Amino acid sequence: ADFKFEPMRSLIYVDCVSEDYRPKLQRWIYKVHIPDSISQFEPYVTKYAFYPSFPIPPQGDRFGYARMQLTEHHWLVSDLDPRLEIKAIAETFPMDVLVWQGQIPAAAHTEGNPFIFAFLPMWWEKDLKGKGRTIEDGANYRFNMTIGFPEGVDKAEGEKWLFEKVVPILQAAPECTRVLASAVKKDINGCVMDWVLEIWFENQSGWYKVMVDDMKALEKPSWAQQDAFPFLKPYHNVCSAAVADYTPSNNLANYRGYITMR
Amino acid sequence: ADFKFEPMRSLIYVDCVSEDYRPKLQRWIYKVHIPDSISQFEPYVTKYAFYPSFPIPPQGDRFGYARMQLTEHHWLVSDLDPRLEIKAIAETFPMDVLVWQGQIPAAEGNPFIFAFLPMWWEKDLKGKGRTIEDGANYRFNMTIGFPEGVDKAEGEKWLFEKVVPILQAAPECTRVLASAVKKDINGCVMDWVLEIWFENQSGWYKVMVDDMKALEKPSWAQQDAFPFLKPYHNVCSAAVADYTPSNNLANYRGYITMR
Amino acid sequence: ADFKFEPMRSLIYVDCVSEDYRPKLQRWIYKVHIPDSISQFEPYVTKYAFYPSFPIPPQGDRFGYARMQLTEHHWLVSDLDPRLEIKAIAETFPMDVLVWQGQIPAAEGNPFIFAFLPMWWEKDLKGKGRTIEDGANYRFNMTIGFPEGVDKAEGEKWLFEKVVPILQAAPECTRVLASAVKKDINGCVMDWVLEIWFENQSGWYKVMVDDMKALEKPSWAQQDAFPFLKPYHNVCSAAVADYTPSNNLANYRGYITMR
Amino acid sequence: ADFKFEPMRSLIYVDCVSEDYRPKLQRWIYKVHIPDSISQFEPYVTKYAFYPSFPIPPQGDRFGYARMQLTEHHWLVSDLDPRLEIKAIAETFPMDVLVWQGQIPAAAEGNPFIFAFLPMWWEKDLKGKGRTIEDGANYRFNMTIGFPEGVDKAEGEKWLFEKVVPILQAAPECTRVLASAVKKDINGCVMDWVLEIWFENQSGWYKVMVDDMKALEKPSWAQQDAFPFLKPYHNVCSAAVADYTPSNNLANYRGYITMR
Amino acid sequence: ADFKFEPMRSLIYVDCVSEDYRPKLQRWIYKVHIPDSISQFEPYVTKYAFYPSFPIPPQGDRFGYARMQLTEHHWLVSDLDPRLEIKAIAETFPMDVLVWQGQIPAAAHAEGNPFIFAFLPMWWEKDLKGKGRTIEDGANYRFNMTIGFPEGVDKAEGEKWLFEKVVPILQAAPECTRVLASAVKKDINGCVMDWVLEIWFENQSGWYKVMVDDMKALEKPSWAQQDAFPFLKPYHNVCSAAVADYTPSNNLANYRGYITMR
Amino acid sequence: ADFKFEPMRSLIYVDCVSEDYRPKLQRWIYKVHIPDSISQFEPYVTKYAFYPSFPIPPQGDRFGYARMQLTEHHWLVSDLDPRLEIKAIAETFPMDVLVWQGQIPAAEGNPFIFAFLPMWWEKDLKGKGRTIEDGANYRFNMTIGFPEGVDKAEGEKWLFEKVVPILQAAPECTRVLASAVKKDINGCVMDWVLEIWFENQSGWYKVMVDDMKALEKPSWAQQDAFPFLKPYHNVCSAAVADYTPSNNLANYRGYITMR
Ligand SMILES: [Cl-]
Ligand SMILES: [Cl-]
Ligand SMILES: [Cl-]
Ligand SMILES: [Cl-]
Ligand SMILES: [Cl-]
Ligand SMILES: [Cl-]
Ligand SMILES: [Cl-]
Ligand SMILES: [Cl-]
Ligand SMILES: [Cl-]
Ligand SMILES: [Cl-]
Ligand SMILES: [Cl-]
Ligand SMILES: [Cl-]
Ligand SMILES: [Cl-]
Ligand SMILES: [Cl-]
Ligand SMILES: [Cl-]
Ligand SMILES: [Cl-]
Ligand SMILES: [Cl-]
Ligand SMILES: [Cl-]
């Protein structure tokens, strides 16, 4: 049967829950996960890239801040088509990786965070602030954030709150240079997230001024899961990362094996 | 909503209107425009290449000859879908570029010609089976658009029953390929893209200037001799080599400067 | 008109019928064929690779063993759409290539076998979850086509109910994958492609020769022993490694010669 | 006149003194600095790589921890030969880069640009010889030190190798010790030694480099109370890095492609 | 016996004497000459690049203007060591290449032009104007010119002319943004050239103003081989090219075979 | 202290003593050994390449035929300088690699042969001027070391006055190149490396087997027929193509596995 042309961009929010796990997590990512991934999808993924997270900002834990990276794929077909489940060579993926990322607890005793994998169209749906910004305008602190309203919250209500209450604070903040948003494609993989936003600042101080201090003006919604914006349960209903404009890890173009420092 | 699979090849005819602008324009192209472009379309353009123009031949001005290059994209989706208007980072584009290319005067300019085509030539009119072993080609790519008021079917018939036979009859001409421009994509005023190969510039001139003198001047002619169309407005062209080193998705490594 | 999005993987079984032809065939493949091919399909083939065959195993001749390589393409559109027949530059193709590969005798031919598949295996029949860390594979890729007049459903039933269970039972076999050939694309006489992994040639022989002796000879058999099909006409194969250096769209840098 | 074949590895310790500068510094490094650099030295530098620093560990400030990266060059000739001063195209280098790296204080003390030349091969292998990549991920702590003015270099060397290295050797958390003398003849670098000291992770680093080092006596020349006893960023610099970098610039750079 | 470490940069001035030869010449260079060359010297040449010439400027013929390109190598050893004469595979080199480049004259296809292959140190020896210029300062029209004084002229006399009379005009011209020079290594291959200069302008009009109009003030030297500057026999005693800052033909890095346009 | 500029080409002759070891050995070479090696010497090795051997020809066993590959390095400094013994990361090297290559039994062990040479052949003894346009070569690279007690000058004279003339006389032999091994580097037992080109395996056999029967057996002979030297201990060889896809500093992109 036919395969549907379904061009999409996806984002995975990859945390590292202790600095002691960072070397092992990073090794697995770059030594094992890259080649396993390229091996599988080279023919129908046009871009596969990692954007390391900037250092977690103050109060970033409240925004489900991914301490390792954003992982980005651009697909030509849906990875969730059941026909794609069959692979000659499966990826090497031990449960330790889930520990390092905080999806499971480290050691048996006798609180895990979900794997958030959000599919989007390849083009942002809403260009809300900063249209026409070029790279010549300077370095961006790009805060990418995904949010999913809690169970029982009417999605249209949440949408209206986001666009009529939250975004206007971003608009008013001269520190914020760009606001972009897309609806998550929920029909692909059942992701609990509803929106992905990207909100740019000059720097971490700008991010804090706007996302912590200016947001104190919002009323706390009745559905709030924490006392302050984003009012959503960290890592479950909100995830985020701040990233640079450029990554060296444009993996289909730039990977040459796991060469080690002398 | 869905995005339509629309594989296409497009050509842009990039002029340079003064030799004094060449270094500036070339810098912008290779230093600024390449990375902005790749950044935007890497996920849905499978090839992005520049073919620098050979030196403008004698009378080339009358064919809307692009003195810089042909820019070539191979798209998997239509770049003119309105959803594709949104971009996180927009291209760095000094208005001087439009002066360099002749779109606006320094103080009528020539239009920006961006023609979409199917990926495969629609008509193979001379030289089927030619291989690269057959030798180096002087490849003359030309796009034409009939003036307002000219019936497109009339124009087509003229092109294929009067112009193409002169190409076919010339031993100097080794290949003739043609496609209709996909007018539905972006409103391009061109109607056809032809590619016409010669051994060399002398061959090009022999056929495109001397042999074409036998044509009758059409009633809609905008200039006295073939192509009978307003240079840069209703005809644009470039002569290029078989190979370019600027296969930009594969070969670009940053703007490295000479020592 | 539109072009259909048709993601496919194809395999070509490339033999070398005499060791004396190896240097010449290998030169054409790597010096001439690669650049001609990339030139034609770069915009719509996302992967183009050669997997050189391991040395022919004992009795491998009975399996139509390709003594040069498997050639693998990943297509976004069907290469057999008649619009794709037109090419600016055709491939340089000496008729001797056909002699080297055995399609024509040098002064009975074997057919050129070019099988199109979906990009993902349709059937995972042994070894699901095997990773590269589990060790090196001897990957025996085999394509079969039942003879004229054999009901395709009865061949399929034999394959999956008689042959595959022997593979499933053998500890020497670590993986069994299978897909139906897309016969609508190019009229390929093959019906299935299977890939069957072993640790090594000895394992392959134990299973594909010794264990298969237990099969009853089908009424339609074209040879006495499994695969019961005419070598190179109704069965072709190769054993290959997990990795190839010849991932051509990514890795090719011209025909650089040893010093 | 002839040019001397002088194969060397150099290290530059690149700080980032405020998180607010990180985007600008990183952009300049990757967008501006890489192509300028490759333009100049492609014909006589065989490797040019950046190793981004892991997050600064607790007390890392006392070690002159480079919060951006280590910059690594492998040279075939000396960059300090006076003939190499002439270049067709000079680097684009705005003053602000010096603020972002902390060489100039923002409008309390500036820190020096530390650029240490070494032989390409480590001179001393003091622990963990034979370790392979199969043995696991390393937290590689690279540290350069330079004894204060007035301290006899041989006395400093004796202290380093007779007092400090034994503590590293005693710790099972330390898996590797390597050292080379700095080639001070090349560019007058104040540093005297570069060591690389491997751990499994930041907690192992801390246990050894902070807790175990408490056993050392404070030298009479100490510039701070605890090990390394040297003035941060002036007489000691360091970074913890991974085994692998994607920024192997002569092989891997394809221009400054921006996220969509 | 030992091989001497001899880092050098060399330049070859490649002409195309008729436009009708351009497709053939360009094809041989990129389809045949690149792979033959890389095959031979990959282990001891660290950079191999072509800089295509800008369009020949008015009166450029008088400067021995190379209408195809400059070919540039960076060597670690001297290519003229006799031990390097032996090669497993020799280059494919039709005599027609010599016709296309002008080494064999049209007269039977009066005088051919020599193959000029100048070895230099890797670093310019003299920085005569524009020290400190960066790429941010703007696009350069880089006029690279080599000169060799006629037989009979004392090299010190020629050097004195060059510095007393020519260099001051270059330095004084506001249109000239950079002047660099090196002495040709005369001990490598017998090259008849004595100097390589590179002289930058904004554009061809600036090149003309200085190299044609400002040079009209010069007295004709007793040894002149033509009536106006450079006073040297085009293509025999002077060769040149105007080139851009950047080339896509950085062959050791960027070459992927002779891929043809569709 | 200074490091000496010492440009050299080295060759390692890599055997695979059983076909059952081929997948394992090949995997270690390409998955493990490439990255460890590039990691160590990227800054001072300008080329690192593998030339897979053509199928072992008849009687190739008597020439110490390397059934896996030639491994070729171009060095800027001597790898045997004692300062180069120190490495941050040592190569991952399972003892089984010694078994696969035949240095130890799972038969007498065979030594690791690592011959250093100048980067340029010292002697050009037939075929000077041959280009790649002349056609595909079957390149037989052979290294020999005279047995203990044989005067090296005597061996040299026999090589160049008795053996090489037979190669030169044969129309089947198109090229003969030789260099003396740099024995001061690593104490290699080999004395000479020769490369001897043919059109194909049949030509190789005609010359190296049949034509060589005319030689008198030397008094120091270790086997009855040419090469008269102990296979794998005093002679090693491989036949290889002009081109390899395994030009490892340029072409390696990690161990990507077939789908
Ligand atoms: Cl919930
Ligand atoms: Cl509110
Ligand atoms: Cl709370
Ligand atoms: Cl009109
Ligand atoms: Cl007419
Ligand atoms: Cl049949
Ligand atoms: Cl049927
Ligand atoms: Cl049965
Ligand atoms: Cl039979
Ligand atoms: Cl001090
Ligand atoms: Cl102490
Ligand atoms: Cl001409
Ligand atoms: Cl003269
Ligand atoms: Cl004068
Ligand atoms: Cl004159
Ligand atoms: Cl012996
Ligand atoms: Cl004899
Ligand atoms: Cl014997």
Q: Position of tokens 């036949």? A: F239
Q: Contact, A112 vs A102, CB < 8 A?
A: yes
What whole-number distance in Å separates Cα of residue C88 and Cα of residue B51?
A: 16
How far does residue E60's CA lie from ligand 14's centre (Å)? 21
Q: How many residues does chain F have?
A: 259
Q: Half-sphere exposure (CA, 13 Å, Cβ side) for A184? A: 26
Q: Which of B43, B255, B258 sits opposite D35 (nearest CB)?
A: B255
Contact D39 B259 (CB under 8 A): yes
Q: Contact, E70 vs E12, CB < 8 A?
A: yes
Q: How many residues does chain A have?
A: 262
What SS3 class is residue E195?
A: strand
What whole-number distance in Å separates Cα of residue F239 and Cα of residue F53?
A: 5
What whole-number distance in Å separates Cα of residue E84 and Cα of residue E106?
A: 33
What whole-number distance in Å separates Cα of residue D49 and Cα of residue A261?
A: 10
Q: Which of A189, A197, A191 is nearest to A230 (CA)?
A: A197
Q: Contact, B94 vs A133, CB < 8 A?
A: no
Residue B142, number of CB atoms within 10 A of its CB: 23
Q: Which of B194, B78, B185 is nearest to B126 (CA)?
A: B194
Dig out the tokens for F247 from the structure: 């030009």
Q: Partners of D198 in the beta sheet?
A: D140, D176
**Long-range own/partner contacts, residues C187-190 (CB < 8 A, 24 or more apart):** C188/C113, C188/C114, C188/C115, C188/C116, C188/C145, C189/C111, C189/C113, C189/C145, C189/C233, C189/C234, C190/C113, C190/C115, C190/C143, C190/C144, C190/C145, C190/C234, C190/C236
Q: Which residues surround ligand 10, an ion (CB under 5 A)?
A: D 148-149
Which string of DSSP letters, residue by residue, matches B157-187? HHIIIIIHHHHHH-TT--EEEEEE--HHHH-
Dig out the tokens for A175 from the structure: 């520190």
Q: Partners of D53 in the beta sheet?
A: none
Q: Contact, F253 vs F34, CB < 8 A?
A: no
The dihedrals phi and psi of A51, each to the nearest 5 degrees, come to -120, 100
Q: Partners of E14 in the beta sheet?
A: E69
In the β-sheet with C235-240, what is the strand arrangement from edge to edge? C123-126, C173-180, C192-198, C138-144, C235-240
What whole-number distance in Å separates Cα of residue A48 and Cα of residue A53?
A: 16
Q: Which of F133, F92, F84, F114 is nearest to F181 (CA)?
A: F114
* C-alpha distance from residue C243 to each of A31, A39, C236, D121, F257 (Å): 16, 10, 21, 33, 5
Element housing A74 (H / E): strand A69-75
Q: Which of E194, E193, E126 is nearest to E159 (CA)?
A: E194
Q: How many residues does chain B have?
A: 259
Contact E88 F177 (CB under 8 A): yes
Instruction: Give start and end residues of each alpha helix (H) in chain B.
Output: 22-27, 34-41, 96-100, 152-158, 164-169, 183-186, 201-205, 248-251
Q: Contact, C246 vs C49, CB < 8 A?
A: yes
The dihedrals phi and psi of A50, each to the nearest 5 degrees, come to -120, 135
How far does residue E198's CA lie from ligand 15's centre (Å)? 24
How far does residue E183's CA lie from ligand 15's centre (Å)? 26
The dihedrals phi and psi of B134, each to the nearest 5 degrees, come to -70, -15
Q: Which of B52, B15, D247, A252 is nearest to E249 (CA)?
A: B52
The dihedrals phi and psi of D49, each to the nearest 5 degrees, come to -145, 150
Tell me whether chains C and E touch (3+ CB pairs under 8 A).
yes
b/e sequence B15-46, b meaning 16+ C-beta within 10 Å? bbbebebbbbbbbbbbbbbbbbbbbbbbbbbb
Contact F251 C242 (CB under 8 A): no
**Residue D35: closest C-alpha in chain E:** E135
The terminus-to-terminus CA distance of chain F in angstroms comes to 51
Dig out the tokens for A159 from the structure: 């949408």
Tell me whether chains C and D touch (3+ CB pairs under 8 A).
no
Q: Contact, C185 vs C116, CB < 8 A?
A: yes
Q: Contact, B241 vs E26, CB < 8 A?
A: yes
Tell me whether chains C and F touch (3+ CB pairs under 8 A).
yes
Peptide bond connecting C227 to the previous residue in cis, omega within 30 degrees of 0: yes
What counts of helices (H) and strands (E) characterise chain C? 8, 9
Q: Contact, B51 vs E52, CB < 8 A?
A: no
Q: Contact, E83 vs E249, CB < 8 A?
A: no
Name every chain B residue with its beta carbon within 8 A of the beta carbon of C47: none
What whole-number distance in Å separates Cα of residue C129 and Cα of residue E10?
A: 56
How far does residue C185's CA lie from ligand 7's centre (Å)? 18
User: Can you give F78-107 as a three-state secondary structure string?
Assistant: CCCCHHHHCCCCECCCCCHHHHHHCCCCCC
Contact E90 F9 (CB under 8 A): no
Residue-number span of the structural domain to which E136 is assigned: 1-262
Give C2's contacts (C-beta < 8 A, 6+ positions apart). B5, B6
Dig out the tokens for B110 from the structure: 């020539």
b/e sequence B214-245, b meaning 16+ C-beta within 10 Å? ebeebebbeeeebbbbbbbbbbbbbbbbbbbb
Q: Contact, D230 vs D236, CB < 8 A?
A: yes
The dihedrals phi and psi of C32, each to the nearest 5 degrees, come to -115, -55
Q: Contact, E112 vs E95, CB < 8 A?
A: no
Into how many domains does chain B fold? 1
In the β-sheet with B235-240, what is the strand arrangement from edge to edge? B123-126, B175-180, B192-198, B138-144, B235-240
Residue B71, number of CB atoms within 10 A of its CB: 21
Q: Which of E78, C94, D161 is nearest to F120 (CA)?
A: E78
Give B153's contacts (C-beta < 8 A, 6+ positions apart). none
Q: Contact, D191 vs D114, CB < 8 A?
A: yes
What is the DSSP code (8-state) at residue B25? H
Q: Which of C118, E3, B18 is nearest to F259 (CA)?
A: C118
Q: What is the largest CA-CA distance in chain B?
A: 57
What whole-number distance in Å separates Cα of residue D68 and Cα of residue D18?
A: 10
Residue D82, number of CB atoms within 10 A of its CB: 8
Burial of F49 (0-12, 13-18, 19+ CB in 10 A): buried
Dig out the tokens for D49 from the structure: 């790589």
Q: Which of C209, D36, F244 is nearest to E39 (CA)?
A: F244
Q: Which residues surround ligand 1, an ion (CB under 5 A)?
A: A 150-151
**Residue B251: closest C-alpha in chain D:** D254
Resolution (A): 1.8
Burial of F90 (0-12, 13-18, 19+ CB in 10 A): middle
What whole-number distance in Å separates Cα of residue D101 and Cα of residue D15?
A: 5
Cα dihedral D136, D139, D140, D141 in deg (nearest 10): -160
Identity of the amino acid at A163:
F
Give B214's contacts (C-beta < 8 A, 6+ positions apart). B166
b/e sequence B247-259, b meaning 16+ C-beta within 10 Å? bbbbbbbbbbbbb
Q: Contact, A37 vs A70, CB < 8 A?
A: no
Q: Half-sphere exposure (CA, 13 Å, Cβ side) for D65? A: 18
Q: Half-sphere exposure (CA, 13 Å, Cβ side) for A4? A: 11
What whole-number distance in Å separates Cα of residue F69 and Cα of residue F55?
A: 11
**Residue A253: closest C-alpha in chain B:** B250
Q: Position of tokens 């349960």? A: A233
How far does residue D190's CA lie from ligand 10's centre (Å)? 9
All chains having 3 or more CB pairs closer than 8 angstroms to chain D = A, B, E, F
- Indicate which technique resolved this structure: X-ray
Residue A182, number of CB atoms within 10 A of its CB: 21
How far does residue C234's CA lie from ligand 9's centre (Å)? 14
What SS3 class is residue D178?
A: strand
Cα dihedral C200, C203, C204, C207 in deg (nearest 10): -170
Dig out the tokens for E85 from the structure: 């004469």
Identity of the amino acid at C129:
G
Q: Which of B73, B65, B87, B63 is nearest to B14 (CA)?
A: B65
Which string of DSSP letters, residue by residue, matches E86-145? --SSB----THHHHHHTSS-GGG--------EEEE-SS-SEEEE-TT-BGGG---EEEEE
What whole-number distance in Å separates Cα of residue A158 and Cα of residue A211?
A: 18
Q: Contact, B237 vs E254, CB < 8 A?
A: no
Q: Partners of A119 in the beta sheet?
A: A10
Q: Position of tokens 């706007």? A: A210
* Gap from C253 CA to chain E (nearest CA, Å): 4
Residue C8, number of CB atoms within 10 A of its CB: 20
For strand A69-75 and strand A8-14, is the pairing parallel, antiparallel, or unpaired?
antiparallel
Name every chain C residue with its beta carbon within 8 A of the beta carbon of A91: 131
What whole-number distance in Å separates Cα of residue A218 and Cα of residue A231?
A: 10
Q: Which of E178, E106, E103, E95 is nearest to E135 (CA)?
A: E178
Q: Contact, E251 vs E48, CB < 8 A?
A: yes
Contact C130 A89 (CB under 8 A): yes
In the β-sheet with D193-199, what is the strand arrangement from edge to edge? D124-127, D176-181, D193-199, D139-145, D236-241
Name every chain C residue with its beta carbon within 8 A of the beta carbon of E88: 257-259
Q: Which residues surround ligand 13, an ion (CB under 5 A)?
A: E 150-151
Which string of DSSP letters, residue by residue, matches F133-160? GG---EEEEEEE-PPTT--HHHHHHHII
- Distance from the Cα of residue C40 to its chain's centroid: 22
Q: Position of tokens 């602000």? A: D96
What whole-number distance in Å separates Cα of residue B202 and Cα of residue C68?
A: 46
Dig out the tokens for C213 from the structure: 């002796």
In the β-sheet with A117-120, what is the strand arrangement from edge to edge? A45-52, A69-75, A8-14, A117-120
Which string of DSSP letters, residue by residue, matches A147-178? E-PPTT--HHHHHHHIIIIIHHHHHH-TTEEE
Q: Which of A13, A55, A50 is nearest to A146 (CA)?
A: A13
Identity of the amino acid at F195:
E
Contact C39 E259 (CB under 8 A): yes
**Residue B49: closest C-alpha in chain C:** C43
Q: Which of C182, C178, C183, C204 is nearest to C193 (CA)?
A: C178
b/e sequence D203-227, b meaning 16+ C-beta within 10 Å? bbbbbbbbebbeebeebebbeeeeb
Q: Contact, F167 vs F226, CB < 8 A?
A: no
* C-alpha distance from residue B56 to each of B98, B181, B209, E206 (Å): 20, 24, 14, 22
